């Protein structure tokens, strides 16, 4: 992936205001509501019957913080996303068997939760930089499939 410095600046700058304890559980909660088939991987999480049940599910909020961490890590290692996500690619590809299209969907649902919290602050040039980010993350996360 290729972020120009200006892009990097825009990205971390907005990241620096991100509520890392909720944002993650928001994006994962939405992904389970918007694309219902992903709920196949979380039968252990319990109550996922309504949107309200999904967003207020502790495990969701909990697991989300996890995922969000994965990203923060990508953000700090923009130039070696492959190495950064090596063990998670084997977990989601060889073990869980999650379709890499789903990684693209998740990365997109986040770009949604980002624009939603930052409003006018998430400008088009800012979104274009974050799009290069989630693209690099899904691509590397799907490396055990390439």
């Amino acid at each position: 992936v290729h972020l120009t410095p200006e892009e990097k600046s825009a990205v971390t700058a907005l990241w620096g205001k991100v509520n890392v304890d909720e944002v993650g559980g928001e994006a994962l909660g939405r992904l389970l509501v918007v694309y219902p088939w992903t709920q196949r991987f979380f039968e252990s999480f319990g109550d996922l019957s309504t949107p309200d049940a999904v967003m207020g599910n502790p495990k969701v909020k909990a697991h989300g913080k996890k995922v969000l961490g994965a990203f923060s890590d990508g953000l700090a290692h923009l130039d070696n996303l492959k190495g950064t996500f090596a063990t998670l690619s084997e977990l989601h590809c060889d073990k869980l068997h999650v379709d890499p299209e789903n990684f693209r969907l998740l990365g997109n649902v986040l770009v949604c939760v980002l624009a939603h919290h930052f409003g006018k602050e998430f400008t088009p040039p800012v979104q274009a930089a974050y799009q290069k980010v989630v693209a690099g993350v899904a691509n590397a996360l799907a490396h055990k499939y390439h």
Binding site: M55, H116, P125
Partner: protein, 141 residues
């Protein structure tokens, strides 16, 4: 397939766009051109830079199209037939691209209408845009 709730939701949300209809459509478009540069090639005749009168013009065109779907949610294949023919026959737009734009539309909506963009409603809008894309792509031959 849209449910009554999806319907009520999409209607409700769209309603809060008001006179901003063509302004948002123009933004979504810009968003798309920037995040997904491949889509720029469908408009060699437009100047796609920020503030482009053309983009502004086209955005409104797009904004109306969707309002039409909203109004004719129960008869979408028909309401949009004319445009379906345009995108597939004459324009030959790759079906992949109706997904990129449907995304840039959701993005723009959340960036301007945060009190409306709840998870339940986001669900609705996604299903909607997908129905639309389904129709504007239902005519390849």
């Amino acid at each position: 397939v849209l449910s009554p709730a999806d319907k009520t939701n999409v209607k409700a949300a769209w309603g809060k766009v008001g006179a901003h209809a063509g302004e948002y459509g123009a933004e979504a478009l810009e968003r798309m051109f920037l995040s997904f540069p491949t889509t720029k090639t469908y408009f060699p005749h437009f100047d796609l830079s920020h503030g482009s009168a053309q983009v502004k013009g086209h955005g409104k065109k797009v904004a109306d199209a969707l309002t039409n779907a909203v109004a004719h949610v129960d008869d979408m294949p028909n309401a949009l037939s004319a445009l379906s023919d345009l995108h597939a026959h004459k324009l030959r737009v790759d079906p992949v691209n109706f997904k990129l734009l449907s995304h840039c539309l959701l993005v723009t909506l959340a960036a301007h209408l945060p009190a409306e963009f709840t998870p339940a409603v986001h669900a609705s809008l996604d299903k909607f845009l997908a129905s639309v894309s389904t129709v504007l792509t239902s005519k390849y031959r």
